[PDB]
Amino acid sequence: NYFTKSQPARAAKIDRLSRIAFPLLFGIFNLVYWATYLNR
Amino acid sequence: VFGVTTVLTMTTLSISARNSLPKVAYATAMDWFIAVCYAFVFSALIEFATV
Amino acid sequence: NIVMTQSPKSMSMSVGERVTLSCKASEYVGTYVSWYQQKPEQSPKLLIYGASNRYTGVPDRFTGSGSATDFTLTIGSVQAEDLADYHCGQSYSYPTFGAGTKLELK
Amino acid sequence: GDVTVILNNLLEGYDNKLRPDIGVKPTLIHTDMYVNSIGPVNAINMEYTIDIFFAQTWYDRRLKFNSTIKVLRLNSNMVGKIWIPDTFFRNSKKADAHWITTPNRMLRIWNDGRVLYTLRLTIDAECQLQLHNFPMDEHSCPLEFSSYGYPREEIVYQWKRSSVEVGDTRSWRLYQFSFVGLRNTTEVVKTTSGDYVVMSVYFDLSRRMGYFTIQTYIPCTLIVVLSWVSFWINKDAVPARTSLGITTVLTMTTLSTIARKSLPKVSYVTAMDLFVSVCFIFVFSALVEYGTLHYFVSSQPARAAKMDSYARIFFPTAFCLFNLVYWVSYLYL
Amino acid sequence: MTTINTHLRETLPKIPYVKAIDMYLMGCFVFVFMALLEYALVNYIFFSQPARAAAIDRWSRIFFPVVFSFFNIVYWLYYV
Amino acid sequence: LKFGSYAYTRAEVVYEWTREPARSVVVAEDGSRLNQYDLLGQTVDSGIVQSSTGEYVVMTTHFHLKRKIGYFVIQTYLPCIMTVILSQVSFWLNRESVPART
Ligand SMILES: *[C@@H]1O[C@H](CO)[C@@H](O[C@@H]2O[C@H](CO)[C@@H](O[C@@H]3O[C@H](CO[C@H]4O[C@H](CO[C@H]5O[C@H](CO)[C@@H](O)[C@H](O)[C@@H]5O[C@H]5O[C@H](CO)[C@@H](O)[C@H](O)[C@@H]5O)[C@@H](O)[C@H](O[C@H]5O[C@H](CO)[C@@H](O)[C@H](O)[C@@H]5O)[C@@H]4O)[C@@H](O)[C@H](O[C@H]4O[C@H](CO)[C@@H](O)[C@H](O)[C@@H]4O[C@H]4O[C@H](CO)[C@@H](O)[C@H](O)[C@@H]4O[C@H]4O[C@H](CO)[C@@H](O)[C@H](O)[C@@H]4O)[C@@H]3O)[C@H](O)[C@H]2NC(C)=O)[C@H](O)[C@H]1NC(C)=O
Ligand SMILES: *[C@@H]1O[C@H](CO)[C@@H](O[C@@H]2O[C@H](CO)[C@@H](O)[C@H](O)[C@H]2NC(C)=O)[C@H](O)[C@H]1NC(C)=O
Ligand SMILES: CN1C(=O)CN=C(c2ccccc2)c2cc(Cl)ccc21
Ligand SMILES: CN1C(=O)CN=C(c2ccccc2)c2cc(Cl)ccc21
Ligand SMILES: CN1C(=O)CN=C(c2ccccc2)c2cc(Cl)ccc21
Structure with missing residues (x-):
């Protein structure tokens, strides 16, 4: 919003980049977290 | 935002009013008052939607 | 069926040296591992009852060390009367013994 | 046997209503504690739980026997038949002993009349917490005890040199606090019934x-x-x-x-x-x-x-x- | 919907399985959530074409109560 | 679950299991009031505690428990994921709707 106008x-x-970087990063965090806390 | x-x-x-009395299966007079008031509020929002 | 694996299968040792015997269990045996000694043409004699408790009539050179699965029997000043076989056996379940270790002199 | 005749001879003409040296000198009582755990220190009611093994020792010249055995080691059956001091915790809101499966008490009488009496207690003691600097605060709040009816001229308490022993300190129920140390104290307080010897144990806690x-x-x-x-x-x-x-x-x-x-x-x-x-x-x-x-x-x-x-x-x-x-x-x- | 659910949960014990009332709350939440997502989808393609946007809007206006009534009959026929 | 003797040392009263140690502590089949955990098995042991008054026999029993995740999933881990998704859906609204995304 600050960079418009x-x-x-x-x-x-940056809105198109953060439209695809956020679900990927959240999915990677989910995979790593559940893998490290289910195999513990 | 008024209506919602x-x-x-x-x-x-x-929800905060129904916890005072026990878990009876019938309707009380506070339940009827709350139901009619909820109907009035919901009706006001539906009239706004129509307008 | 808890299996006890004893190591080594055969050992040799001289007089007056420290020696260490090991017994490993497949499943959990708390402190119910016992160490027996058997001389040739004799009945086995209980040395260590439970993990780390000497039986009445055992010299103070035998000492045991216990855990959940790993067990040790150590002899200190070894004389010429420790030339025998040594069995480890568990009693947490129906008893199973180890294979034994025959000490010899060389 | 022989222990039965010794115990029957000790209790003939015995009066458990009178302390030893009832008109001679005050009775000296040596006290030991073993803190098993210090429970949750909740600040709402200004209290904390503690579990201890309270041990007392004194001399009773009436329980003196001559025999080839040195010590009589007994259960809680004979605790109510001899004189037991009336120790009570002055800053306790609620306190109970343990009764499962049998009353958790111990009595041991020696050859010269020395009695050792141990029992397990769970105390819910009281301490006013000055809750300034919260949650970066440190407290030191006590566990006090004394006799209820016997003043300084009748019962005197005294710590040993190995008085209070804590346990493992890791299995304790201290969630928000951390044990740092302890110190013992003895004093005499004036009360409406008389002057009483009061002993205190201060536990120092720091909030994490x-x-x-x-x-x-x-x-x-x-x-x-x-x-x-x-x-x-x-x-x-x-x-x-x-x-x-x-x-x-x-x-x-x-x-x-x-x-x-x-x-x-x-x-x-x-x-x-x-x-x-x-x-x-x-x-x-x-x-x-x-x-x-x-x-x-x-x-x-x-x-x-x-x-x-x-x-x-x-x-x-x-x-x-x-x-x-x-x-x-x-x-x- | 979240407020409604939170108030109910504190009463019941910490059981792992899904109750019937929890199933109903998950259904109602999924419905209001997909309504918000449908608005997000109509707002994403609003400047480009209004025909598809209006079509999705009038399709939602008829097919959300029908699917809700289908869910309600399946629920009140399976749990009775 | 540790139990032993009060007032009787190791030279006076000793404890032992009446059957094989693996078969002495027996948990019933329908005997489970657990809602949040799962009993996996039992484990006994026997030892000695060294007190200020002597050595005492102590019989130990361990019950192994495993926490069920089904409650905490629906309570916290699924609402957190749905809230993160609800935050991420703001990236698809147009840049001309500033109070909406706010
Ligand atoms: C208002 O009313 C209230 C309700 O009436 C009242 O409360 C009651 O107070 C009295 C007095 O304080 C209590 O009486 C005593 O209880 C002592 C033990 O107490 C605790 O345990 C009881 C339950 O009692 C059982 O369990 C113990 C331990 O196992 C047994 O030893 C008891 O016999 C009794 O057992 C029966 O029931 C069990 C199941 O519970 C069965 O498993 C068992 O087989 C029996 O069937 C609890 O209720 C108490 O809870 C209360 O108090 C605490 C205090 O802090 C509170 O915190 C708590 O919340 C509860 O309120 C507590 O847990 C007994 O030991 C004691 O018996 C002794 O002393 C008297 C006086 O000298 C003797 O006459 C008597 O014979 C007992 O003596 C012998 O045994 C002791 C054992 O230590 C020996 O040391 C002693 O030498 C003597 O041995 C002799 O006899 C033996 C056989 O008995 C023999 O073998 C020996 O060889 C020797 O000859 C007494 O009974 C009463 O329990 C309270 N009841 C309740 C419900 O609270 C309150 O005070 C009133 N207030 C006022 C102001 O009036
Ligand atoms: C508990 O109390 C005893 C005595 O009341 C304290 O003991 C003394 O320790 C000092 C050295 O630290 C000695 O010089 C004294 O002689 C000891 N007193 C006696 C009677 O022997 C003991 O330090 C206290 N424990 C604490 C405060 O933790
Ligand atoms: C009820 N409440 C608020 O609404 C937020 N601000 C207040 C407050 C704010 C400014 C001055 C004094 C008090 C406050 C402070 C505490 Cl320690 C706990 C609840 C609470
Ligand atoms: C090591 N130790 C003590 O010295 C205090 N008394 C003992 C004891 C006292 C009486 C009978 C059996 C054991 C005891 C009991 C516990 Cl539950 C934890 C630590 C501990
Ligand atoms: C377990 N669960 C979900 O995963 C969907 N989002 C949640 C949520 C989202 C934010 C806060 C609380 C709860 C929710 C709401 C209801 Cl009314 C029923 C089931 C349900």
Whole structure:
């Protein structure tokens, strides 16, 4: 929101990047956490 | 936000009010009052939706 | 059926040296492992009843060390009367013994 | 046998209503404790649980026998047939012995008349906790005992040289506290019935801030940073910043209320109330600052342009300075 | 819906399996959650085409009560 | 579950299991009031405690328990995941709806 009306392309780029980086990172955290706490 | 927050407040009042008396299977007079008040609040939101 | 594996299968040793015998259990045996000594053409004699308790009439050179699965029997100043076979046996369940270790002199 | 005749000869002409040396000298009682565990120290009722093996030893010239056996080792069956001191714990709210499966008591009489009496007790003792500096606080609150009816001229207590022994200290029920040490004390107190010899054991405890940290110190600071993020949002989206600020206020109130239910209903300010109070103030100041911003963009824009840019650096520095001064001032005490 | 669920949970004991009332609350929550996701989907493609957006909106207006009534009859016929 | 003798040392009263130690502590089949855990088995032992008054026989029994995750999943781990997903759904709304994403 702060980057709109000054650099719209950067705001669009970081919202499209964070549209796919967040589910991947949360899934990787879920896999690592459940793997380390179910095989413990 | 008027309609939805008053519906939330009615829900909270109903759950927080039914814990005083035991777990009887019939309706009391506070239950009828709460039901009619909930109907009025929900009806106000539905009238807003129609308008 | 708790199996006790005793090591080594055969050992040799001189007089006046420290010696260590080991017994390993497959399952849990708390402190109910006993050590018996059997001379040739004789009946076995209980040396250590339970984990680390000497029987009445055993010299103070035998001493045992216990755990949940790993058990040890150590003799200190070894004389010429420790030339015998040594069995470890568990009593947590129906009793099973080890194979034995025959000490010899060389 | 022989123990039966000895025990029957000791109890003939015996009066368990009279202490030894009833008109000669006071009775000297040597006391030992073994703390099995110090239970949960809840501050709501200002109390703490403790489990001990209380051992007493004294001399009874009536229980003196001549025989080839040196010691009679008995159960609790004969405890009620000889004289037993009336020791009671002065700062206990509730205390009970143990009776499963048989009364957990022990009596041992020696060849010269020395009696040793041991029993297992679970005490729910009382200690007023000065709950300032909470939760960075340290306490030392006692377990006291004395005789109930016999004054200083009739019963005298005395510690041994190996008086109090703690156990493993790891199987104890101290969740929020940490044992650091102990010290014994003996004194004489004046009472309406007479002067009594009172013995105290002070246990020193220190509160480990590991639960209150992840319960209140981390989330309230996170909610403050949540209120901080409103400054980088555009000044034209008025419902966004207002809703953010007031919902942040909601979260602060709910967290404060749910956080105050740990400690008792004390009337003074602690080191935990001040923190959550200042966090609420910070959120209040952020919202009122945006309010004055929205009024000033309409009144005169020359003053409201660089106010938000000033707030963006003034709020974190003020909060960080508050945190530094607060933590040093409350960890120096 | 979360408030409703929280109030109920404190009464019941810590049992692992899913009760019938918990099943109903999960159904109601999944319904209101998919309603919010449907709004997110209509808002994502609103500037590009309004025809598909209006079609999804009027399809939701008819197919959410029908699927809810189907879930309600399946629930009140399996647990009775 | 440790039990032993009060007032009687090891040279006076000793304890022992009446059957084989693996078969002495017997838990019934329908005997389980557990809601949150799962009993896996039993484990006995026997030892000696060294007190200020002598050595005492102590019989130990360990019951092995395993916590059931089914309650805590539905209580915390599934609502946390659903709330994280609800936060992530804000990335799909348009940049012109600032109070919505706020
Ligand atoms: C208001 O009313 C209240 C209700 O009436 C009242 O409370 C009662 O107070 C009295 C007096 O304080 C209590 O009486 C004593 O209890 C002592 C043990 O107490 C605790 O245990 C009881 C239960 O009693 C049982 O269990 C013990 C231990 O196993 C047994 O020894 C008892 O016999 C009794 O056993 C029966 O029941 C068991 C099941 O529970 C069975 O398994 C068992 O087989 C029996 O059937 C609890 O109720 C108590 O709880 C209370 O008090 C505590 C205090 O802190 C509270 O915290 C708690 O909340 C409860 O309120 C507690 O847990 C007994 O030891 C004692 O018996 C002795 O002393 C008297 C006086 O000298 C003797 O006459 C009597 O014979 C007993 O003596 C012998 O045994 C002792 C053992 O230590 C020996 O040392 C002694 O030498 C003597 O041995 C002789 O006899 C033996 C045979 O008996 C023989 O073998 C020996 O060789 C020798 O000859 C006494 O009974 C009473 O229990 C309370 N009841 C309740 C319900 O609370 C309250 O005080 C009133 N208040 C006022 C102000 O008036
Ligand atoms: C418990 O009390 C005893 C005596 O009341 C304390 O004992 C003394 O220890 C000092 C050295 O630390 C000796 O010089 C004294 O002679 C001891 N007293 C006696 C009577 O022998 C003991 O230190 C106390 N334990 C504490 C405070 O933990
Ligand atoms: C009920 N409540 C709130 O709403 C948040 N702010 C308050 C407060 C805020 C500023 C000054 C004084 C008190 C507060 C402080 C505590 Cl220690 C516990 C609950 C609580
Ligand atoms: C090592 N030890 C003591 O010295 C105090 N008395 C003993 C004891 C006292 C009487 C009978 C059996 C054992 C005891 C009991 C426990 Cl439950 C933990 C530690 C401990
Ligand atoms: C276990 N569970 C979910 O996983 C879906 N999200 C949750 C949730 C989300 C946030 C807070 C509390 C609960 C929820 C709400 C209900 Cl009314 C029933 C089941 C249910």
